[PDB]
Design an enzyme around this catalytic site. Structure first.
Site, PDB file in Angstrom:
ATOM      1  N   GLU B  88       0.838  -1.187   0.000  1.00 60.74           N
ATOM      2  CA  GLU B  88       0.000   0.000   0.000  1.00 60.74           C
ATOM      3  C   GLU B  88       0.877   1.242   0.000  1.00 60.74           C
ATOM      4  OE1 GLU B  88      -2.932  -0.571  -0.475  1.00 60.74           O
ATOM      5  OE2 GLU B  88      -3.281  -2.582   0.348  1.00 60.74           O
ATOM      6  N   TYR B 128      -4.224  -2.841  12.125  1.00 63.93           N
ATOM      7  CA  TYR B 128      -5.363  -3.228  12.973  1.00 63.93           C
ATOM      8  C   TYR B 128      -5.469  -4.749  13.054  1.00 63.93           C
ATOM      9  CZ  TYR B 128     -10.447  -3.946  14.199  1.00 63.93           C
ATOM     10  OH  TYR B 128     -11.696  -4.258  14.730  1.00 63.93           O
ATOM     11  N   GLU B 192      -1.622  -3.164  -8.677  1.00 61.08           N
ATOM     12  CA  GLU B 192      -3.031  -3.158  -8.253  1.00 61.08           C
ATOM     13  C   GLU B 192      -3.945  -4.107  -9.017  1.00 61.08           C
ATOM     14  OE1 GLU B 192      -3.241   1.335  -8.255  1.00 61.08           O
ATOM     15  OE2 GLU B 192      -4.031   0.962  -6.251  1.00 61.08           O
TER      16      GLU B 192
HETATM   17 FE   LIG Z   1      -4.768   0.664  -4.817  1.00 59.27          FE
HETATM   18 FE   LIG Z   2      -4.466  -0.792  -1.686  1.00 56.87          FE
END
Ligand SMILES: [Fe+3]
Ligand SMILES: [Fe+3]
Ligand SMILES: [Fe+3]
Ligand SMILES: [Fe+3]
Ligand SMILES: [Pb+2]
Ligand SMILES: [Pb+2]
Lengths: 317, 317
Positions: B88, B128, B192
């Site tokens: 990310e 988390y 992605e």
């Molecule tokens: Fe993305």
């Molecule tokens: Fe992502």
């Protein structure tokens, strides 16, 4: 079990993290978080999520299109939409193109991503208000090229967004880092902490008198976001100062006080242009005191002495 | 009425807007919007807002800490968290440091701001999950330095994030724009659109069998976001190709097919590392077909012919 044994040596040591110039540690790994204040601003921002179009504009449209507003009241609304409409883009673009690259810390960058997206939401808000009221969006968004008081503020702003954008700009010199800190001051303290305030006061004043409440409610959400943007900026500047004390010289301090005094002058000229005679009990006179008062509050937050000493005429702010 | 009369000439003409190299028109003014697909992706992203911690992890914690999961099941969860945890950041940092600067269009940039913030939310999600399960976050986030299959994917990714970051990089040459398009392909289509998919399938497979549903639900929200990220990337690449046709040569097309074939190989090695023997009825064998199948679907979307022709073994995806 790691199948690249040497990789274990790359886990980040908390004490090696720094806000700027940190290229000795892997900046891509969020953990372990060191600047907890940045993570807190991030969570607080996320919790404040809102959508401009969830706020009804029906009463605002009726009022705006009726004959119940004075030309002077319309003027305040139009001038502020004109200024805010592109100020958000200036700020968002600066976070991305200038700040993010040089804040070499993942949790601070997490917040910057929330901050820049919130500027996009603010931009959406002004477009929604323009189309709701039937204003010509092209004219409103072009205000900073058409209205001298707005252009002056934005031209002033460019005097700092400039440098940091150069292809060869670096923060690994005392002068490069000072230049970076002046940009942070210009955007967080001045644009977000001063230039938006006369406008907040004027728009929220309508809201308090039950006029244009849809615009007023949206500005209340924007103000809630901007308070965090400012607080984050203050912590970032203070954090950078603490980790690079050789940067905070009497000379940089004076240059900062100088920039703030100049911004106060520009913000006062903007408040006068919004209120040539006054509406809702407000007079331009009150903004001289108010703008000078918030400038003192901003100065104190980054360790500088207040210089105006004026009282706040809008305590409800 | 404008008090800087010449300013009226600066209103933006719709037909002068371009996705890249557009420095003839004021990029700071959102209106008039030209790429409506970008504004739509933005609104759709905003509508998908979610908070990782609104998803309960109590049942996941109980299951994870019990003796009901096999070591092979735990392995799949650990490897994917290891890879996603920093992927990310790689994507978010690329949007900001490489893409945004060169996509000279405000509505496309509005979307990029939403996209980058969503990558921050994804990062929050993995933190988390780690803290909920009692995993050592420092070990998980450092997986891309410790696990060869993950490192290979990320090292491959760097082979394109590189160039565009150079201080002197520009898109105003056919070769500079081709290099930029290869970066868009590397992040939107490959990272992605391909590298996340074996993982989506594996995690969503647990969810379908009622196991680790909290993680499964979060990945469902991530997949919903990633679908838009991919669709936006596809429209951007296709838009840039349309406005700069001289860029889309047989040579660039072949280099793109080459990068995709290499990514497919790396993704297959990653799926094998996650499934040395198989869990939940899945076998690494199925990912050879699946990864090749989605690669064909991505190729077709940017106008290239499918090359594997394999069938999809997970139609529920
Ligand atoms: Fe993305
Ligand atoms: Fe992502
Ligand atoms: Fe704002
Ligand atoms: Fe702001
Ligand atoms: Pb002046
Ligand atoms: Pb290989």
């Amino acid at each position: 079990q790691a199948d690249i044994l040497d990789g274990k040596q790359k886990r980040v040591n908390l004490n090696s993290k720094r806000l700027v110039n940190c290229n000795q540690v892997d900046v891509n790994q969020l953990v372990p978080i060191k600047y907890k204040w940045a993570w807190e601003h991030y969570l607080n921002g996320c919790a404040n999520n809102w959508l401009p179009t969830e706020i009804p504009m029906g009463k605002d449209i009726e009022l705006w299109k009726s004959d119940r507003l004075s030309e002077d009241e319309r003027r305040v609304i139009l001038l502020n939409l004109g200024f805010f409409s592109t100020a958000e883009s200036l700020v968002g673009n600066n976070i991305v193109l200038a700040i993010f690259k040089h804040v070499t810390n993942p949790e601070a960058r997490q917040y910057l991503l929330r901050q820049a997206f919130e500027e996009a939401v603010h931009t959406h808000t002004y477009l929604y208000i323009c189309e709701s009221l039937g204003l010509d969006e092209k004219e409103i968004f072009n205000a900073y090229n058409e209205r001298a008081a707005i252009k002056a503020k934005d031209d002033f702003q460019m005097e700092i967004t400039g440098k940091v954008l150069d292809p060869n700009f670096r923060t690994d010199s005392v002068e490069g880092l000072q230049e970076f800190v002046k940009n942070l001051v210009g955007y967080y303290i001045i644009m977000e902490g001063i230039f938006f305030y006369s406008g907040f006061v004027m728009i929220l004043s309508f809201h308090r008198q039950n006029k244009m409440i849809g615009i007023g409610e949206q500005y209340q959400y924007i103000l809630r976001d901007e308070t965090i943007h400012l607080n984050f900026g203050i912590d970032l500047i203070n954090g950078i100062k603490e980790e690079n004390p050789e940067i905070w010289t009497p000379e940089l301090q004076q240059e900062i006080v100088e920039l703030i005094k100049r911004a106060v002058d520009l913000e006062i000229e903007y408040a006068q242009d919004c209120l040539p005679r006054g509406i809702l009990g407000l007079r331009a006179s009150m903004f001289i005191d108010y703008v000078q008062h918030i400038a003192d509050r901003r100065l104190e937050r980054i360790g500088l002495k207040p210089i105006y000493h004026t009282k706040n005429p809008f305590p409800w702010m």
